[PDB]
Structures are given as structure tokens and as C-alpha cells.
Design a protein around this ligand. Structure first.
Ligand SMILES: N=C(N)c1ccc(CNC(=O)[C@@H]2CCCN2C(=O)CNC2CCCCCCC2)cc1
Ligand code: NA
Ligand code: NA
Lengths: 27, 250, 10
């Protein structure tokens, strides 16, 4: 339900340093 | 993990450490999928070629960790096993087909900034993201080289086309497996290694920005070798078995 | 290599 949303990132809308690399690969 | 990076704090709140009691030692990676259930690779508990077969009592679960060796007072939670469930058709004799296992905890763990479960994919999430070239993320406290890291390591690696996977090895590859890694042609590198076993291969859904465990760290030939790739258990493919076990043992 | 875990966890 709350799965996969990280308290220190997604829950505060902060992005980790390389997650955009995954996104940009989801071409 | 080779050619990876230190994890950020709170980066992999579902990362779990399989720790041996005596001698106290890292055993494997693993992951938090609920407040009572951890996901790992079957070979972490059972590999007869290496006289490997652990009982619940031989082990401990360490959730919320960052530092490998430290006892992270007030942060990590360390739990006990009530029962181990191994896939009935895990193939340890030939190719580690269905390298998957469940560990049910004694009492639930409490969630925190550092402790949180990852999702398991639905057929549609998997169909959407388990595509050659899409990248996932692997994390673990394993070997830095085919040496030991101070904190959790992380790498992003592109999923690799099935023919390539198959062409890289003499092992009979199966549909319950996928491989990941850069080609030697791509430039960058990186891989999971010894000790990362049972750790999670995770991807972030661009449809709902949640993190999904697609793979489990299972095997490889050497670590980070040119034209070799990491192989991961296909979690969605065995998902029916996962809900069965959980549905059957509450 | 590993720091002492509390014996409460055994
Ligand atoms: N991605 C990687 N480079 C990587 C490499 C190794 C590991 C750890 N896993 C292992 O070491 C596993 C567990 C039992 C034997 N393993 C092997 O890796 C043994 N070597 C081969 C690989 C093929 C399938 C099983 C049959 C025997 C021959 C995890 C990841
Ligand atoms: Na082959
Ligand atoms: Na490689």
C-alpha cells in the first residue's frame, strides 16, 4: 500500500542522485 | 557490487542483511516486502554443493542498515526467523532456476526513515518495465572486486536482450531468469558480486513513481567481466508462488 | 570484521 515510496525521498519529494538515470532509460 | 557507489542514506529502505549468528558474518542480501516478510535468493539458505543448508535459528535479519559491519544503534532493527520457505522447484542441481525463497519474521518490524518495504510488480508493471535497455538498480554489501565495502553500494544497470544473455554463457538460461549489465561495447561497467546474493534488482515505475523489485541477485560468471552479465531471478514469474506462501501462512 | 551485535538478538 505504502510500498516502494521512500520516507527520505518520495515521501518528501526529494530525488536521489541517480534515479533520473533510470527514468531517462525508460525510453 | 563492483564499480558501484555508496548508497545515500534512506536510498534502499527495503534492503535487508542476512547475517550469520556464529560466526557473526554477512550471509546474503534480501529485501523487505511487508512488515513480516523478507525476500531472498534460495541459494542463500540451500546450496548442497557447498554443504549450505541453513535453519531459521542459524540466522538473523538486519533491516535499516547502511554500514556493513557496524551495529547501527537506534537505526537498524535485527529480527528472527519463524520459518523459511524455499521454492519447491528451485533448481540447485543444474542452473539455479527459481532461485527464490521467503523468510517470515518472528514479530513485525517497525517502519522508519530507513526501513520500508518495496513493491512486487503486477503483470502490467513487469510488461512495461522489463525491457532490454531499461535500467534497474542493484544494491548490496558484497565484494567490490571479483574488496569489502564500508557502506551499502549501488549500481544502475541496463537490462539485456535474452539472446545476448544466452549467448554469453554455456548455462541453460530460463524464463525465470533475466540478465543485466553493460556490454563491453557500451563503455560503462558495474555488477553484482559474491555477497550480494539475495539482494534486490529494483526499478522505479514512471507511471506511479513507486519502486518495484523486478529481480533477485542470483548468479554470474566472475564479476564485471567483459561480455558477461549478472543473472537475476524473475520475481514476477514466480509471483504466484509468493502470494501462495504468504496467503497460506498469513 | 563485524562489530558486536547485542546478545539480546543472540
Ligand atoms: N552478477 C554477478 N556477477 C554475480 C555472481 C555471483 C553471485 C553469487 N552467486 C553464486 O555464486 C551462485 C550460487 C551457487 C553457485 N553460484 C555460482 O554463481 C556458480 N557458478 C555457475 C553459475 C551458474 C548456475 C548454477 C550452476 C553452477 C555454476 C551473484 C552475482
Ligand atoms: Na549459450
Ligand atoms: Na560484464
Amino acid at each position: 500500500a505504502d510500498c516502494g515510496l521512500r520516507p527520505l525521498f518520495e515521501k518528501k519529494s526529494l530525488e536521489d542522485k541517480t534515479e533520473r538515470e533510470l527514468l531517462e532509460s525508460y525510453i | 557490487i563492483v564499480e558501484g557507489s555508496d548508497a545515500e542514506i534512506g536510498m534502499s529502505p527495503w534492503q535487508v542483511m542476512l547475517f550469520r549468528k556464529s560466526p557473526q558474518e554477512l550471509l546474503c542480501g534480501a529485501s523487505l516486502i511487508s512488515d513480516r516478510w523478507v525476500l531472498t535468493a534460495a541459494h542463500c539458505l540451500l546450496y548442497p554443493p557447498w554443504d549450505k543448508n541453513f535453519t531459521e535459528n542459524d540466522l538473523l535479519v538486519r533491516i535499516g542498515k547502511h554500514s556493513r559491519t557496524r551495529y547501527e544503534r537506534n537505526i537498524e532493527k535485527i529480527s528472527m526467523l519463524e520459518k523459511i520457505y524455499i521454492h519447491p522447484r528451485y533448481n540447485w542441481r543444474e542452473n539455479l532456476d527459481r532461485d527464490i525463497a521467503l523468510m517470515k519474521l518472528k514479530k513485525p518490524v517497525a517502519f522508519s526513515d530507513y526501513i520500508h518495504p518495496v513493491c512486487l510488480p503486477d503483470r502490467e508493471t513487469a510488461a512495461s518495465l522489463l525491457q532490454a535497455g531499461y535500467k534497474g538498480r542493484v544494491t548490496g554489501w558484497g565484494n567490490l572486486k571479483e574488496g569489502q565495502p564500508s557502506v551499502l553500494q549501488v549500481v544502475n544497470l541496463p537490462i539485456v536482450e535474452r539472446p545476448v544473455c544466452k549467448d554469453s554463457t554455456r548455462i541453460r538460461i530460463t524464463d525465470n531468469m533475466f540478465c543485466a549489465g553493460y556490454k563491453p561495447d557500451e563503455g560503462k561497467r558495474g555488477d553484482a558480486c559474491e555477497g550480494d546474493s539475495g539482494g534486490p534488482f529494483v526499478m522505479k515505475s514512471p507511471f506511479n513513481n513507486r519502486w518495484y523489485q523486478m529481480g533477485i541477485v542470483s548468479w554470474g560468471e566472475g564479476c564485471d567481466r567483459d561480455g558477461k552479465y549478472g543473472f537475476y531471478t524473475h520475481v514476477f514469474r514466480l509471483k504466484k508462488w509468493i502470494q501462495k506462501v504468504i496467503d497460506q501462512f498469513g | 570484521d563485524f562489530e558486536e551485535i547485542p546478545e539480546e538478538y543472540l
